[PDB]
Amino acid sequence: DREQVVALQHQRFAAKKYDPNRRISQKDWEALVEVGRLAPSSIGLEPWKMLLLKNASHFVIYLARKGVTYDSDYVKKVMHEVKKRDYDTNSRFAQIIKNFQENDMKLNSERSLFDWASKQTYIQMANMMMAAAMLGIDSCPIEGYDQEKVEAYLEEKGYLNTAEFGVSVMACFGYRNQEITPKTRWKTEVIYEVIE
């Protein structure tokens, strides 16, 4: 019920202290990765790839694809292989994607295109954290790293092709070893308004 739904939003908090002797089970972790696999994305393009840093219980680096444009190899690939659509750059549909990105959304630079794909990964990460809370597992979203040094690092180890992907965001997962931090938020009237 709605009481339970709201309660879960308090259970989900940014856990900073983790129980080093309790790990997420193999099966629970596979379910959370599945949650990430099944996340929605704009135009269904899934412009992402997740890395588990095995080398908290589990640490995920979310990658977002670069240059995901109507005429890109990746878009043609996902449309054929996943969507089973006979996609080509001169179709009405390709042209709808082109207008949507270039004009509707002003995705006119490499950075704006990358940040657009990165937004989709925030859905993917959010869904995982919320599913983790449903399983009684804690998480913390993580932006606090130097993106240039991290990407140099990953590229050096051979786990990032910087032409194709950039690092988007990270999250860790495990079991908390601290109390649930009470929420502090703006009051409803400040962050929500009805138009007429």
Place this chain on the structure above:
Amino acid sequence: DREQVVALQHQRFAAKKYDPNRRISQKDWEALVEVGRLAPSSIGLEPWKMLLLKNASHFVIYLARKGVTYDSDYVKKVMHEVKKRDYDTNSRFAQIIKNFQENDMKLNSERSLFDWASKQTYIQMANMMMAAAMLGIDSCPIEGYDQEKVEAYLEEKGYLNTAEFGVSVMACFGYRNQEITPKTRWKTEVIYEVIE
């Protein structure tokens, strides 16, 4: 259990056809807005505001704040009013925010700053769609609008101060009047990899 958690991810789909005679109850809607209020954000800044377009059952326009920088009026405001932190631009902490944004995240333009705040709103919208699915309510995330015309429109009606906010994304909520669309996604090995 994990079976139920994964099942929910199939229940949540992009509903395009809605039952025009069934509306979300007042209490269920207030719970979903609460889900949006309680969403996490980078540095806890909540750089957002939601609008219900009342003038699917419920249509939400997610706004993200512009120019949310270490020295901005908004950051000083949220730190004091919500976090009850005696924040000032010359503190170690203000300087950590400055370095994080400018250097770690390369937020060096109005657009990059705006898209960073917009990413946080995708978490907010994701959490609402997932909570909606927990309540048996359907949703569709929506990027398919012309951002310039929409923002001109909202500004004209007096519901958008374009100096302070931009439109980030939209979503609609209600009850489906069609079958659940089966998921099509990349296979696990394509979108997920373990480092060592």
